[PDB]
């Protein structure tokens, strides 16, 4: 009979009748390839952590209603087994909203099919979908609970709900009731909120243990006093002790000094507090998983976060400083620590233009377009992530430049505009709502719209994406749209159909191959890809979508490439989808190339 | 159909009727685990080499008569097809004597069963053994010739024969005849000797192409002028251009500066000479494969050689420098070069005593000992390598010290002496032929004798090993010997039976685990023995070689990652011959350390 409880008498957790507090670290399995799960978790163990903390991103597991992903990189059950097999406990945060700088705070976009849906509330359609999701996830989690033989000792309900406007306690009670129904009555359910009564007011519920979060800028006493007002008895707990912070495209890379993270950790542990380090390893937002803040500002591909373990898992000075702090309070495992992976500079690889996006419509959109009088959003058109192409015809001569505009700022989030195959420039959420175009009457007007990530925090998480309101040309509404959802991922894996089915440039796909020798024990190795001369786009290697590149804005110039997707003898295919300007016109092909280097640059100008 | 030949007209090789010259590096397959063969060869090719050169050690392939090893790490034929797949041609050096800083110059010790054998002569017993070895080896090499679809372009007969005192021409002519019988008439046969007439006098033969060796200290013009006297026509060839040099236990680590090598190389290459860099990667003398020079000094376990590729295959400054030289004459292949392997410091691993050698004789010698009136040699007693225990019984009292001596300097090469389980000290070839001992009449006198490696060069390659002449106690010859051959290798693999001032020589064992499911572990490492003295080390039953931190210059030994596991603990076994740091109450001193950088040049 295994037991994990709160002992309200003694301000403490009890683990099999024994006093316990946790020193945890956040790691997000959706942000580290499965190939490296064990590497990271073992490094986390060797730092002295006795638990880990992770989020379960609903959209990561049910990308359409009733279609589930629980295998490979999506195998949350396996990750939790690994943790347990390494002797770590787990703090599970299954949301259903997780925030986490992740697309729509983990909520699936298809929830937006009800336009007026009020997310994170007792809205009956939101509740019904949550309910069906918990019916699938929580039963899987039940045998992973501590009391049933597994590593899960506490579960978070929601995430900083007190920061949300709605303040719907019926919603929180419903969550509590359904977590209870699927996981039983002994399991420790908790909440996390900012450490101030204004946040705690709407976030705390009777029956859910109130924990707070704060970083190195906060007064510890004040933060835990704010916790004690809601829970006068029980353990002190900082569920997110910030070791670093998040980034946005175009802003400097966020760092937090090692000495400051170490001194706050020492003082938090000295109080007998349980603490989780957010992040311990941050990892990567592969594909289109990044989130955004409002006013619209997208987080980038790297989730390095200045964490103690770097994006690719390296042991940094920070890791060792925090290990040393922990050694002052708890016995740290003996033995050598698994190393930083070796990184290899594969060098310059040339690419060549295969096809424009305009030319690849047949393969990108093989069931054809949707026809509409006014524009439809991504959601109406059954696409959640990536790119949709909006096509109409110009109803007047525009031999003199005419203004193409979205009067209500409804280009969510960026559009690459062409007229009869001539690039016209870009429309941008917030920044540029009007662009001048030229072309003859009856010319084809194309806007390729990119979803740069659904807002994950604040009131505007109901971020539909696409052309969400009308376009005007010379102030008149443009009607009669032909809208192509783009299956970029399939198209890239079939080499735009080539492998069958067993100043601006036009958005287009560029491809090249590089080989790596077999029989070399230490190849392939992790690497970092860099795009000098390129501008904005998406990159795949062998069909694995490594994410978004934007050296024009920074701060991230390199993208992390993990070794297990690279092959030997067989050619590695790099596919770049460049959206704005490619270095490939001039008859210097050596300019049409990318470069693999051995050090990250996530912290430049 | 493919042709390779010397055209005496254009002073050139012709490959498929076209001028050809080679820029080669030496790599010895016997000194690099097979696990890394491709890695070292690929790195060689990315330096701009169009060929490699190697030695076939006879003793590596025929450890007893009629008993062959051509599998796994001993798979020469594989090594050569691998080089071919990579687009490298091969210059093959099959000896039978190869020198090479290798045990008896490649010659098998069982040749010494005929005590009086004159090695490397027309001694008819020596020839009949060689002939049977050629008849097994050269039909294996025949399809690997260039003319038959293979990589092999030239073949060396013997090795610096002109440096050998015997000067037996009939021997060379026999080799020539037998090589032509097995490989056919078209293959380019050549000899290699030092670049001076006194060395070429007994080395060159009619019908074998005469080549020379020399390093950076030599006048390149004079060197090739000496070849030209022997061969007025044909390509110039330096078959061993020294990139570095050999070591001996107890002497400073040899090094040769990159700049000097670069200079001579460019110079040799601009003359249109074919050249081979000796070594390109040197690797390791695992187990007991090192050799020795006369007067007796052994070469160490490491065969780094200050090569362009380090012991563990690392890309050095010297590698990049020679590659930049080769680039000036031949476009070098494109792509990134395979990297230096990652190295991991596994840290300190504690060991504990298992059994002294004395107490392990059941498992080390399961056939019982041999009795003999006087002492017998390693060869007489049917053991070639490692250790043999010679035991007698004190015939008079020695309460006051008494001289135990080898008057003729017959301890070959080092003896670890104990009387009644009490270590007395050490007798050493050429250095200490007398040692004072104590004990009662009837006390057991034990000498653990170590073959430190048979001399690979000079007159004294007939190096039998053991007690090769009598011992005296208080001037009287000791007699009535109980001699135990020791199966150290078997016994270590079975954990000394567990798995079916000085200290007494003893085995110490301990364990370390490496986690599974970590993509970049295990990795290569280097093992170090601080506080230990002299001994042999195995990991998971693989004999990595000899350690001797008390003499240097080599303090670490290379551990290749592929012998390390993650499914079960790894087992380290040390056999410490002189002094183990394992008596004191601090058991944490009885330990070895794994580090990520080699130390092969301690002072
Ligand atoms: C300034 C308001 C804080 C909004 N919350 C943030 S920003 C960084 C972190 C993660 O997003 C996270 O998943 C939140 O719980 C806390 N948080
Ligand atoms: C002046 C001493 C020369 C003895 N010859 C040597 S020592 C280093 C090298 C290798 O042994 C080698 O295999 C010889 O051919 C040349 N040589
Ligand atoms: C924190 O606030 C407490 C009072 O609650 C006070 O004692 C202390 O000075 C404060 N520390 C900091 C760093 O603001
Ligand atoms: C578009 O063109 C008009 C000139 O007709 C000009 O007044 C305006 O600045 C231009 N708009 C943009 C967005 O460049
Ligand atoms: C576009 O235009 C008309 C107003 O004429 C309006 O009826 C419709 O709601 C608008 N649609 C969108 C998506 O803005
Ligand atoms: C890249 O790889 C595949 C073949 O494996 C092929 O479709 C494409 O044609 C290749 N291009 C080059 C230069 O190898
Ligand atoms: C080599 O000898 C020749 C004379 O044969 C002399 O001209 C030359 O300088 C010498 N070269 C070197 C490098 O000493
Ligand atoms: C001890 O050995 C030394 C040198 O071998 C010798 O001179 C001395 O006589 C020995 N001891 C005695 C008791 O003589
Ligand atoms: C040892 O000495 C004896 C007696 O003089 C002699 O028979 C024999 O040749 C010697 N044996 C060796 C191996 O020296
Ligand atoms: C393995 O090594 C460990 C050292 O921690 C030792 O305690 C144990 O006895 C060893 N096991 C075996 C099977 O030798
Ligand atoms: Cl987390
Ligand atoms: Cl060689």
Curated annotation (Swiss-Prot), chain B:
Impact after mutating residue 242 to D: In GM1G3; originally classified as Morquio syndrome
Stated name of the protein: Beta-galactosidase
Tissue/organ expression: Detected in placenta (at protein level). Detected in fibroblasts and testis.
Subunit structure: Homodimer. May form higher multimers.
Keyword annotations: Cytoplasm, Disease variant, Disulfide bond, Gangliosidosis, Glycoprotein, Glycosidase, Hydrolase, Lysosome, Mucopolysaccharidosis, Signal, Zymogen
Mutagenesis / variant outcome for changing residue 546 to C: In GM1G1; loss of galactosidase activity
Effect listed in the UniProt record for changing residue 95 to R: In GM1G1; decrease in galactosidase activity
UniProt organism field: Homo sapiens
Outcome reported for the amino acid change (mutating residue 553 to L): In GM1G2; decrease in galactosidase activity
Gene: GLB1
């Amino acid at each position: 009979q295994r037991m994990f409880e709160i002992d309200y008498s003694r301000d403490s957790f009890l683990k099999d009748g024994q006093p316990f507090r946790y020193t945890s670290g956040s790691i997000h399995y959706s942000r580290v390839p499965r190939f490296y799960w064990k590497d990271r978790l073992l490094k986390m163990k060797m730092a002295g952590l006795n638990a880990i903390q992770t989020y379960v991103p609903w959209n990561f597991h049910e990308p359409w209603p009733g279609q589930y992903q629980f295998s490979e990189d999506h195998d949350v059950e396996y990750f939790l087994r690994l943790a347990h097999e390494l002797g770590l406990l787990v703090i599970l945060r299954p949301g259903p909203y997780i925030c986490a700088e992740w697309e729509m705070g983990g909520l699936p976009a298809w929830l937006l099919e009800k336009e007026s849906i009020l997310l994170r509330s007792s809205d009956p359609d939101y509740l019904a979908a949550v309910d069906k999701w918990l019916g699938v996830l929580l039963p899987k989690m039940k045998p992973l609970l501590y009391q049933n033989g597994g590593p899960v000792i506490t579960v978070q309900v929601e995430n900083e709900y007190g920061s949300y406007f709605a303040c719907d306690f019926d919603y929180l009670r419903f969550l509590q009731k359904r977590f209870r129904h699927h996981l039983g009555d002994d399991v420790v359910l908790f909440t996390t909120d900012g450490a101030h009564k204004t946040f705690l007011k709407c976030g705390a519920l009777q029956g859910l243990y109130t924990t707070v979060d704060f970083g190195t800028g906060s007064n510890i006493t004040d933060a835990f006093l704010s916790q004690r007002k809601c829970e006068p008895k029980g353990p002190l707990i900082n569920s997110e002790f910030y070791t670093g912070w998040l980034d946005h495209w175009g802003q400097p890379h966020s760092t937090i000094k090692t000495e400051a993270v170490a001194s706050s950790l020492y003082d938090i542990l000295a109080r007998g507090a349980s603490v989780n380090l957010y992040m311990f390893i941050g990892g990567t937002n592969f594909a289109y998983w990044n989130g955004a803040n409002s006013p619209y500002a997208a987080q980038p591909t790297s989730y390095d976060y200045d964490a103690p373990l770097s994006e690719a898992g390296d042991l940094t000075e920070k890791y060792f400083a925090l290990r040393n702090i922990i050694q002052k309070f708890e016995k740290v495992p003996e033995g050598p620590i698994p190393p930083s992976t070796p990184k290899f500079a594969y060098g310059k690889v040339t690419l060549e233009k295969l096809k424009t996006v305009g030319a690849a419509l047949d393969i990108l959109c093989p069931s054809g377009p949707i026809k509409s009088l006014y524009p439809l959003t991504f959601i109406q058109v059954k696409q959640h992530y990536g790119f949709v192409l909006y096509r109409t015809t110009l109803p007047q001569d525009c031999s003199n430049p005419a203004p193409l505009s979205s009067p209500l700022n409804g280009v969510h989030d960026r559009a690459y505009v062409a007229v009869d195959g001539i690039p016209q420039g870009v429309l941008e959420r917030n920044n540029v709502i009007t662009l001048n175009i030229t072309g003859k009457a009856g010319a084809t007007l194309d806007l390729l719209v990119e979803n740069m990530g659904r807002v994950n925090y604040g009131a505007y998480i109901n971020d539909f994406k696409g052309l969400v309101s009308n376009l005007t040309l010379s102030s008149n509404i443009l009607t009669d749209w032909t809208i192509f959802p783009l299956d970029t991922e399939d198209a890239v894996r079939s080499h735009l159909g080539g492998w069958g089915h067993r100043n601006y440039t036009l958005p287009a796909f560029y491809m090249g191959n590089f080989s790596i020798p077999s029989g070399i024990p230490d190849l392939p190795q992790d690497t970092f890809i860099q795009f000098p001369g390129w501008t904005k786009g998406q990159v795949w290697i062998n069909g694995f979508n490594l994410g978004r590149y934007w050296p024009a804005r920074g701060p991230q110039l390199t993208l992390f490439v993990p070794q297990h997707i690279l092959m030997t003898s067989a050619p590695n295919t790099i596919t770049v989808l460049e959206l704005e300007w490619a270095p490939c016109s001039s008859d210097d092909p050596e300019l049409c190339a990318v470069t693999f280097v051995d050090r990250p640059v996530i912290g430049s100008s």
